[PDB]
Structure 1
Amino acid sequence: MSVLISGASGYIAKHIVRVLLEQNYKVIGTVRSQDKADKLLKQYNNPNLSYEIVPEIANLDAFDDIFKKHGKEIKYVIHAASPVNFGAKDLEKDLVIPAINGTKNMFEAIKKYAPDTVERVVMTASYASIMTPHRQNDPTLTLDEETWNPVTEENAYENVFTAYCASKTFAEKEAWKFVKENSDAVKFKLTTIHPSFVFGPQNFDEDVTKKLNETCEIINGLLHAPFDTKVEKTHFSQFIDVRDVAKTHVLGFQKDELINQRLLLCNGAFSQQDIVNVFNEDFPELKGQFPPEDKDTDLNKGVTGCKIDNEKTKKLLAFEFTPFHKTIHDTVYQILHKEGRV
């Protein structure tokens, strides 16, 4: 009944591991180094937790060794390893190849070493494989669980963000392709999770560092920006709370109605300024130590960009999502409390 989770040192995955351990699962995480494994084992201090070292998911047969050692005991796999790096300068090597090859490696290792043993795979895709990046501001576009980002290899590298979104899209396409082509040979059912921009506190307070993971660094950078920084007040994207994302991944292998589903995880549109407004509203004692409040945002004028039809996802998952204001509140409180400021 063990659960394997790839890329277990990241922001989202550390919450997923927390949830798995709350539910008394045996958990095997993959991390790039013994260094990171040691630190994580100390953080969780839980004997149900172990780590195996996968230094590079892009490399040849990267997940074979895990299923050679643990094939018999792994019943569920959460494939969460993929790079989120908006500073990437080698876009094929840094983003697209690890995304695709990590997915192919994980699925082929299962097929080779545990085809009748692994029952469910839950893959972290993204809202990025559903949305069209240059149409996030287009209210005539409606997205649902069957919509695909139409990016091609031809136009994927317009910039680092389209390249990251293409990495997500191409990896996901390979997963469904594998599932369709091996439905007779491998037992597992696939579920894909599609979070939008993920905010919320780090699983451990000690992981509030100078620079956070990419998506929470949006909040962290705004919170520490000089007062006169220019803050954009136009629609940016959709968000989802990291704790909702983690809860969804675990439900993903437990609930039969999530089999063969793409789950679209959005709970609200936002601008950078809507984030900053929470700073000022909820910590008025600190006003002036970060950019000021401004209620003239796209959101407040009824401007939310492309429309999210995730009613099916919300109905299947049944639990209520965390609202934007609380998600930002808890992210900011964690940082400022860590700093001794509140």
Structure 2
Amino acid sequence: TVVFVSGATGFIAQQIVKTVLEAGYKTIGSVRKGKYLKSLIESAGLNSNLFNYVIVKDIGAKGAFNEALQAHPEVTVFLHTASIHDVEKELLKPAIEGTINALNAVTVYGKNVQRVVITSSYAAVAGFANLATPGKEVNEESWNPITYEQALENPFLGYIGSKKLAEKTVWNYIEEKKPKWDVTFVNPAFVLGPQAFAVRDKSKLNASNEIINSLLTANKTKVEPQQFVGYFIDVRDVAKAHLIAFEKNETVGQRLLLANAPFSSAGILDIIEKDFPNLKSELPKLDKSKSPKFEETESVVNNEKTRRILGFKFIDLKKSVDDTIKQLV
């Protein structure tokens, strides 16, 4: 098998590129640095003859992957991973077009592709903010009731909208165009965990791991840490689920809800104080009033279907946080 991965230099994608190579599959990643990632795998001890790369400056531009799928027609898996606070220019339309630019380039040029795995999100599963359904039931088939108009009112709700709607463009495409490849959706919740190989900037991680990292850099930046609630998932569990999304035949047309257990910025902090006492002078005191309560925004995730299909045991929060902190010293 030959697995293509868009935006390979990303947080989840680097873990995706890693666990695939550990399964012996070939890999071909996209890059905006190609030697930054190839020097990373070989030095990591991985079996390093299963990876090359392509250069793609932008995903939201038309035909972004055509010359990538016209230089290598051998690919048979497409892992579309590349897709918070922005600048408030435009976040919705490039997110839906960036996906469409790939569904138009995988169909028009990549015909050796059989399975496509679109990395979506839990934001396309349950509602946020004014559409919060606290205490209510959500599962693989549930959908965020947010609309395009109700989105991009916030860099937060806009990201929530841009992720719920970009998955819709795949659902509309597979029926409007009726392609020859099969689709699978991996819907990761709040992804935590350590980098695939090596951290590059210890002061700022990805937007998701800053949930952990802000607790460390708070006393340096003198920034009161923004607290969060919701469901977490370890980046290694998401990486393993992306393989099952194309290696297994029962994941076809399934929205793999990649959520473990609830979490909280306060709950994550307690793990760091116990397992890393040398940091007790670097960890802050969280305000009990600034803390969002769980039973108020988040629904009840019913991913019983996904856990049964994945079949493996996920990484607990303690191991996820411990492995995360171990990298940043």
TM-score by length of 2: 0.91
Partner in structure 2 of residue 243 of structure 1: 236
Partner in structure 2 of residue 172 of structure 1: 167
Partner in structure 2 of residue 132 of structure 1: 127
Aligned-pair CA distance for 1:98: 2.9
Two-structure CA RMSD over aligned residues (Å): 2.5
Report the count of equivalent residues. 323
Q: 1:39 aligns with which of 36, 39, 45?
A: 36
Partner in structure 2 of residue 10 of structure 1: 10
Matched, 1:275 2:275: no
Q: Is the 8 A contact 2:225 2:286 kept in 1?
A: no
Q: Map 1:188-337 to 2 at 5 A.
A: 188-226=181-219, 230=224, 236-292=229-285, 305-336=298-329
Give, as a single letter, the amino acid of the residue that structure 2 aligns with 1:99: A
Q: Is the 8 A contact 1:135 1:141 kept in 2?
A: no
Structure 1 unaligned residues grouped into runs of 5+:
337-342
Q: 2:115 aligns with which of 111, 115, 120?
A: 120
Partner in structure 2 of residue 110 of structure 1: 106
Aligned-pair CA distance for 1:243: 0.2
Aligned-pair CA distance for 1:317: 0.7
CA distance in 2, matches of 1:301, 1:140: 9
CA distance in 2, matches of 1:262, 1:301: 24
**Range that drifts further, 218-227 or 273-282:** 218-227
Question: Identity across aligned pairs (percent)?
Answer: 40
Q: Name the SS of the counterpart of 1:155 in structure 2.
A: coil
CA distance in 1, matches of 2:165, 2:297: 27
Q: Name the SS of the counterpart of 1:322 in structure 2.
A: coil
TM-score by length of 1: 0.87
Change (3 A) 1:315 1:135: farther
Q: Is the 8 A contact 1:78 1:122 kept in 2?
A: yes
Q: Once superposed, which parts of structure 1, at least 4 consecutive aligned residues long, lie more than 6 Å away? A: 293-304
Give, as a single letter, the amino acid of the residue that structure 1 aligns with 2:17: V
Partner in structure 2 of residue 101 of structure 1: 97
Q: Map 1:28-67 to 2 at 5 A.
A: 28-32=28-32, 36-45=33-42, 46-67=48-69
Q: Is the 8 A contact 2:131 2:145 kept in 1?
A: no
Q: Is the 8 A contact 2:12 2:238 kept in 1?
A: yes
Q: Map 1:63-82 to 2 at 5 A.
A: 63-71=65-73, 73-82=74-83
Q: Is the 8 A contact 1:270 1:299 kept in 2?
A: no
Partner in structure 1 of residue 45 of structure 2: none
Partner in structure 2 of residue 340 of structure 1: none
